[PDB]
């Protein structure tokens, strides 16, 4: 608003200079006629004598230079002393801004450009990593999973923030690189300008900033969910087959409780009661609880695993699987039988070859998919993704609402306040700007919420690790690792730079301290990219495999 204030004040000087000159009386001697040499207002000045008027009030630094004067010599010929190329000349040397400030401004110009190249590099490489991470997740078709969908949207917010910062600095060069042509050029520059673009981009940055906070809260929320929701082999079959606490009868006629646990093949239901008592060690009349059923089911899986290892066709594939995909195999040996699953020769081969995508396509081309498409969809997903995601209730719709809905509630009201009451420069102003808190409240609330869930997560992770419940190979541990590093990585940054950026006094020290914070935070995109994509073992494996199929393709054949 300094360029805007000065052009308005100079036009005012220009207008009221002509009026002030009109009311002057006609001369009585040889005089230099009343003029406005576009810089100052000159009255009728007698020949030889030098005129002196106070510095023009339209100047931004008028407050300081207030008492000084501008001079102009009137020639002995009656016309004003002209310049070298016959131009309007005057001595406004003592109306100029402080020589000390011009040198200091030349120094701030160097550091603003020096700091710009540095953070532009940081933002460029963190954005580059992000686009590559989104390309990888997307390309490998791994964006189906609830975890990856969250990561992609977290990446999208870090893309938006980083990219809108570069657009703002880019537009600021484009605008201020322009030359002061004429008064028409200035009028076109201020009024009919792309100052709107600057501000549209600022809104995307503000939204970027808050959405970053929200998408990191949903990471903590999704993890807090996964850890509590401890899905196992028993849980998937309690869904697929169903738990039956009372004494039921199997399809063949014989008595069977829980998840198809046979007691006696004979039709004697009275004798079956005495057989059930042998397992737990006490009388139950014919009904067992959840803890009794899952302890008894863990014998069925131990018995089914034994058989799979004794089977020459199933043992090669079984060993080349993780604990989750093994559960999907043990699951279909429960519905199909041991000899039945051994029939999936082609599918089992590619499931051993880790070709999860094409394995899932021909497993769906099976006669088994047609008979039970519901149960097949879930186990086919478990083989494709290596996660219990198909057997867990997703809150993904909520997560989009938290991640993108919540910043929406505060950025657009802010953008309205900004539009009416604080429509100045580029709108990027973040702290102690009056109604700064409109955008700070949602982030304060997200760090506060994200703090309490972190503690709950670490409390429940320590407990689950001490109870040998979670093994260092389970995908939940691997996800827990990258999430529980990112949260204290970003958390500590906030705490530290709250003391580092305590420099309130305007200068180069303040500017470098401001730069220190923003520079270290420019790499954040690269952090989320490595943690949620590049360090992912499954992503690393798929890329390694798709590269070896390329190494055989264009080298051996072509």
């Amino acid at each position: 608003q300094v360029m805007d204030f000065l052009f308005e004040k100079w036009k005012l000087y220009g207008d009221q200079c002509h009026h002030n000159l009109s009311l002057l009386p006609p001369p009585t001697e040889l005089v230099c006629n009343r003029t406005f040499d576009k810089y100052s207002c000159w009255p009728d000045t007698p020949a030889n004598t030098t005129a002196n008027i106070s510095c023009p009030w339209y100047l931004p630094w008028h407050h300081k230079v207030q008492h000084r004067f501008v001079f102009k010599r009137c020639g002995p010929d009656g016309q004003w002393v002209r310049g070298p190329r016959g131009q309007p000349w005057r001595d406004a040397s003592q109306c100029q801004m402080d020589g000390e400030e011009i040198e200091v401004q030349k120094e701030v110009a160097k550091m603003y450009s020096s700091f710009q190249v540095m953070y532009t590099v940081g933002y460029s490489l963190s954005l580059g990593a992000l686009l590559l991470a989104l390309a990888i997740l997307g390309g490998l078709s791994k964006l189906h999973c609830t975890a990856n969908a969250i990561h992609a949207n977290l990446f999208a917010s870090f893309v938006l923030k980083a990219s809108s910062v570069l657009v703002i600095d880019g537009l600021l060069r484009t605008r201020y690189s322009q030359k002061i042509g004429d008064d028409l050029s200035v009028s076109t520059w201020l009024s009919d300008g792309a100052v709107a673009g600057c501000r549209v981009a600022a809104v995307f940055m503000q939204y970027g900033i808050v959405a970053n906070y929200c998408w990191l809260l949903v990471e903590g929320l999704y993890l807090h969910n996964l850890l509590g929701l401890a899905t196992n082999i028993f849980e998937m079959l309690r869904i697929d087959e169903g738990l039956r606490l009372k004494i039921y009868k199997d399809t063949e006629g014989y008595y069977t409780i829980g998840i198809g646990h046979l007691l006696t093949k004979s039709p004697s239901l009275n004798a079956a009661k005495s057989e059930l008592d042998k397992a737990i060690g006490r009388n139950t009349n014919g009904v067992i609880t959840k803890d009794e059923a899952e302890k008894l089911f863990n014998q069925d899986v131990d018995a089914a695993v034994r058989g799979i290892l004794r089977n020459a066709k199933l043992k090669p594939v079984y060993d080349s699987l993780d604990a989750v995909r093994r559960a999907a195999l043990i699951n279909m040996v429960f519905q199909m039988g041991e000899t039945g699953v051994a029939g999936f020769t082609n599918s089992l081969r590619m499931l051993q070859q880790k070709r999860w995508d094409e394995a899932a396509v021909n497993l769906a081309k099976s006669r088994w998919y047609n008979q039970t498409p519901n149960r097949a969809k879930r186990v086919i997903t478990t083989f494709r993704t290596g996660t219990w995601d198909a057997y867990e209730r997703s809150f993904f719709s909520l997560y989009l609402g938290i991640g993108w809905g919540a910043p929406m509630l505060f950025v657009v009201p802010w953008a309205v306040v900004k539009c009416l009451f604080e429509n100045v420069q580029c709108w990027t102003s973040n702290d102690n700007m009056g109604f700064w808190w409109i955008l700070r409240f949602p982030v304060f609330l997200a760090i506060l919420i994200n703090f309490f869930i972190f503690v709950r997560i670490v409390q429940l992770l320590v407990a689950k690790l001490r109870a040998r419940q979670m093994h260092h190979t389970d995908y939940k541990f691997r996800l827990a690792k990258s999430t529980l590093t990112l949260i204290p990585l970003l958390g500590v940054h906030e705490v530290v730079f709250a003391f580092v950026t305590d420099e309130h006094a305007q200068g180069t020290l303040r500017s470098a301290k401001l730069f220190f914070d923003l520079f270290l935070s420019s790499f954040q995109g690269l952090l989320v990219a490595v943690l949620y994509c590049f360090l992912n073992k499954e992503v690393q494996s798929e890329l390694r495999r798709r590269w070896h199929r390329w190494r055989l393709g264009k080298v051996l054949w072509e």
Partner: peptide
Amino acid sequence: SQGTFTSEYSKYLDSRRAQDFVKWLLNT
């Protein structure tokens, strides 16, 4: 601090342009 830096920078660019308009008033 990004927004706060970009802010001070634009506050500067504007003040820098304002004095350069005064150079235009002094030369024409």
